[PDB]
Amino acid sequence: QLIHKDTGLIKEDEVFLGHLPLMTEDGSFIINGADRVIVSQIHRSPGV
Amino acid sequence: DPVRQYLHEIGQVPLLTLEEEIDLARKVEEGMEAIKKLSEATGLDQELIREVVRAKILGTARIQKIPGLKEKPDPKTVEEVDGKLKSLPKELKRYLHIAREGEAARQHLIEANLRLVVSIAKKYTGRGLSFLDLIQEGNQGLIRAVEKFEYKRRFKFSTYATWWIRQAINRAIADQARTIRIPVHMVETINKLSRTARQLQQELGREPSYEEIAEAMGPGWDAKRVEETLKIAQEPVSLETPIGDEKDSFYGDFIPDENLPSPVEAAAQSLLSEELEKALSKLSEREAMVLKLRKGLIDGREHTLEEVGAYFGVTRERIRQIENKALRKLKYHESRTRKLRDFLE
């Protein structure tokens, strides 16, 4: 929803965003007609 | 950092109040009209005396010797017009001085509005051209905006300037950003295409097809045309583009050379020329000579009919019959040996 602070104009209006890849049941995606997988990454935990 | 350097350098020269602005514009126009009046004085062109005055202003010897190695000689055509303009009465003289001052004012005005240009170029990034390039194109557009400006219209110079800077930067994207040269018209065309595509992709919820986007483009637009313009729009690919996770391979070194004959090809051509040479030798001398006159086996060119007839002193028809006969005799001997039955691809 888009608004105007000073005007009080409310034009809500839906919109688009883009295309989001969906993960299959096995747990892999398909990019450009090729089955691909995103491996899990390991780093150190946030904090001090 | 060069950007820091230039930004600070223009940060040195301050802005200009309305008074300063109007006064500078005034002095500039006075300078120009002084140049015209001097054109009525000694009878020489405006830009002539103008560039001479500049040569006396924005540097001594450096304006002449390096806009390329050849322009207008320092001791000769510069200094003689200088001395010729030197030898005039008082009014034309004071107008000379006025002209010079006008030039200087032009320079300063240019500087403050260089700050302006920097703002505008700061707006335009993402190009396919670097920031400082944007700044400089905008700066040329600024010198341009300064030249044609009129203060009498009582408008703040900033607006007029802005338009010119903007158009100059767009001239940059048109003339620069793509590795291959794409002229202005199709640049604007492609821009409209992409813009509309974005619009109806927002509307439909999905990317269009060439047909619907062509219809959305109006008359004269079909699928083939948008496909073609899109075919032109695409950029080249860097030869050094990495292939795979390997650090040892590029994209470019996977490209074969079809321009250069392979050893097998050179050997093939060799064997062809030789075997043809031997298969030719069993013909009569004259007919063989005629054939190799036709083929380009002598000078490489193609000697027609009449030419061969002229060289051997006979009619062209005779030559024709001769070559046909030769062809058929080769048909026999080749039907035998089968050495030349290859090379048929």
């Binding site: - | 996977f254 250069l260 050893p263 050179a266 050997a267």
Partner: protein, 96 residues
């Protein structure tokens, strides 16, 4: 690679091997005729096809690329002779 119908990469270590053996013409063929040398591989294939012994190559042709690349760096690369005289590996080509 195989997919490109490629030839085997002869590494620097293998050069060191051949040098250790002391095989000069094997290393020569490896570095010239059998690898990148145009006229070398052409005349060689020609010779074997005609049943000769392959001739002696001249210019690896990657080395000429190296020369002109060095010249693009504004470094003058002079290939001299026994007596300190210019020998042009570009034959009537870049001479001008």
């Amino acid at each position: 690679g195989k997919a490109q119908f490629g030839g085997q990469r002869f590494g620097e270590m293998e050069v060191w091997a051949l040098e250790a053996y002391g095989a000069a013409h094997t290393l020569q063929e490896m570095l010239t005729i059998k690898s990148d040398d145009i006229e070398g591989r052409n005349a060689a294939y020609q010779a074997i096809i005609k049943g000769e012994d392959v001739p002696e190559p001249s210019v690896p042709e990657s080395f000429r690329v190296l020369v002109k690349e060095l010249q693009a760096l504004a470094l003058d690369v002079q290939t001299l002779d026994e007596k300190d005289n210019p020998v042009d590996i570009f034959e009537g080509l870049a001479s001008k």
